[PDB]
Design a protein around this nucleic acid. Structure first.
Length: 48
DNA sequence: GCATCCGTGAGTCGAGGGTAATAAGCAGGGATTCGCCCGGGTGTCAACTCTTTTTTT
């Protein structure tokens, strides 16, 4: 994207995607074989 | 006649409950679609006339 917009007479915070990688970190906790539901049934299961 | 490489298989019933990311712009002309309104066919009612089963004479 930096080739289209003129670099001269520009500033930051505009040539940067708002959520270019936030979805990649949000999908990790949401859908992942490792990150699973919490077994919060008793104090022993919370520690095991 | 053998050596190398590409398809099928994997039990069965039950739990558990939804998900998620990129992102030009404006000018011409038609097809589409929502508001109002006249309207003619469908209902809902005042209100004028034959028949007759007795109930009265």
């Amino acid at each position: 994207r930096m080739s289209s917009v003129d670099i001269d007479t520009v500033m930051p915070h505009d040539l940067i995607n708002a959520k270019p990688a936030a979805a990649a970190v949000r999908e990790f906790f949401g859908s992942s074989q490792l990150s699973q539901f919490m077994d919060q049934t008793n104090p022993l299961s919370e520690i095991t």
